[PDB]
Amino acid sequence: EEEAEQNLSELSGPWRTVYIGSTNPEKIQENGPFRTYFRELVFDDEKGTVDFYFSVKRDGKWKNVHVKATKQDDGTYVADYEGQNVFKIVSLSRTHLVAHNINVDKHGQTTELTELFVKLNVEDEDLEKFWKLTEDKGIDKKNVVNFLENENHPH
Amino acid sequence: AQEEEAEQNLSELSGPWRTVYIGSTNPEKIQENGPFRTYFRELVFDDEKGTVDFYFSVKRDGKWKNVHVKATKQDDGTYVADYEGQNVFKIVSLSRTHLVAHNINVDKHGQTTELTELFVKLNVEDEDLEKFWKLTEDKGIDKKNVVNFLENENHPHPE
Ligand SMILES: Nc1cccc2cc3ccccc3cc12
Ligand SMILES: Nc1cccc2cc3ccccc3cc12
């Protein structure tokens, strides 16, 4: 019985959007800039940054977007995306993230958003059980597809 | 006496699941446009009827399809289901977060293919859901202005 050491960087990896709420419905409606499907998040304790990787559909087509947020002294984060954003992490753990974002667009319009995201965790022993079974059945490693990375890098 | 009955309570594990890895003795079956290149979405276990409903997506002929398959348990402990032929699969390892399975498929030409798979569950805890709803209520956001991204038709394509 063992568990990996807790590190903020250990939180990095595949994450998925569960719910997103908005004070302005238009921002999260179809073709809205904040109807974001998360792919991955990367936390960097040293630089005080969080890199966001998500997909959003615009003009009827899906786009992959990357946004880097920078932490401030007050613990909040700032990021440039469809205007200026100030993001606060309300709750964070190995499996979930609840955040509050304040966005002010190119027209001075303010929108507040809430979100719940969940992390997809793949444990070491589960991976080992999969590979053992795979080799027991005589399946070549090149005959294995990684669906998770496909979902994390869509098109 | 052979083995004894197994106290089975998997109803608990129902919910959103995702495909991590799928291996195959026949690469054609899981290559692009392959029938088993299946992206899981949801799994529902019924302990009383002894079944498992699979909800997944697969790309066929350049087109995405949402598929629903019902599997039925057997005295054997394995499950059988019809999908691109006859299937007999076994759950090798299972927990609140992962599923490792072995499936044997025989297509319409009698060809036998063995597949292995690792799937992970997307667990949404009540404590976290409550935190989200409280925060959402605090920001004066109406429940109708909240979008569910777990169960939504309009989503990105993995390929
Ligand atoms: N700072 C941000 C940058 C890009 C997308 C975001 C999407 C969000 C969704 C819910 C709550 C906060 C969010 C912050 C975001
Ligand atoms: N019963 C099933 C129906 C449809 C696709 C499946 C894909 C699988 C992949 C690896 C192991 C078992 C599988 C069972 C499947």
Cα–Cα distance, A149 to B50 (Å, whole number)? 33
What is the Å distance from ligand 1's center to A32 Cα? 13
CB under 8 Å to A96, separation ≥6 — which residues? Answer: A116, A117, A118, A119, B124, B125, B128
| Nearest to B41, CA basis, from B144, B159, B155 | B155
Cα–Cα distance, B49 to B110 (Å, whole number)? 30
3-state secondary structure B106-121: ECCCCCEEEEEEEEEE
How close is the nearest chain B Cα to the Cα of A79, in Å? Answer: 20
Q: Is residue A21 less than 8 Å (CB to CB) from chain B?
A: yes
Quick one: how far is CA B32 from the chain centroid? 19
User: Resolution reached, in Å?
Assistant: 1.8
Cα–Cα distance, A81 to A70 (Å, whole number)? 13
Quick one: how far is CA A119 from the chain centroid? 8
The tokens describing B113, both together, are 């293919």
**Which domains does chain B possess?**
1-159 (2.40.128.20)
Q: Is residue B149 less than 8 Å (CB to CB) from chain A?
A: yes
Cα–Cα distance, A108 to B153 (Å, whole number)? 33
Cα–Cα distance, B90 to B76 (Å, whole number)? 10
Cα–Cα distance, A35 to A38 (Å, whole number)? 10
Are B116 and A133 within 8 A, CB to CB? yes
What is the Å distance from ligand 2's center to A153 Cα? 23
The tokens describing B30, both together, are 């899981």
* Structural contact between residues A106 and B136, judged by C-beta atoms closer than 8 angstroms: no
* Structural contact between residues B56 and B40, judged by C-beta atoms closer than 8 angstroms: yes
Q: How was this structure determined?
A: X-ray
| Nearest to B21, CA basis, from A81, A34, A32, A126 | A126
Angle at Cα B48 formed by Cα B46 and Cα B53, nearest 5°?
Answer: 25
Backbone angles phi, psi at A73, to 5 degrees: -60, -35
Residue length, chain B? 159
Q: Provide long-range contacts, Cβ within 8 A and 24+ apart, for B93-101.
A: B93/A126, B93/A129, B94/B10, B94/B13, B95/A126, B96/B12, B96/B13, B96/B121, B96/B123, B97/A121, B97/A123, B97/A126, B97/B121, B97/B123, B98/A122, B98/A123, B98/A126, B99/B13, B99/B17, B99/B43, B100/A126, B100/A129, B100/A130, B100/A133
Query: After which residues do gaps appear in chain A, with C to N over 2.5 Å?
Result: none
Cα–Cα distance, B157 to B93 (Å, whole number)? 29
Are A114 and B136 within 8 A, CB to CB? yes
What is the Å distance from ligand 2's center to A32 Cα? 35
3-state secondary structure chain A: CCCCCCCHHHHCEEEEEEEEEECCHHHCCCCCCCCCEEEEEEEECCCCEEEEEEEEEECCEEEEEEEEEEECCCCCEEEECCCEEEEEEEEECCCEEEEEEEEECCCCCEEEEEEEEEECCCCHHHHHHHHHHHHHCCCCHHHEEEHHHHHHCCC
Residue of A121, A144, A150 with shortest CB distance to B159: A150
Instruction: Give the ligand whose atoms come closest to the C-alpha of residue B132.
Output: 1
Residue length, chain A? 155
How crowded is residue A53: how many other Cβ atoms within 10 Å of its Cβ?
Answer: 17
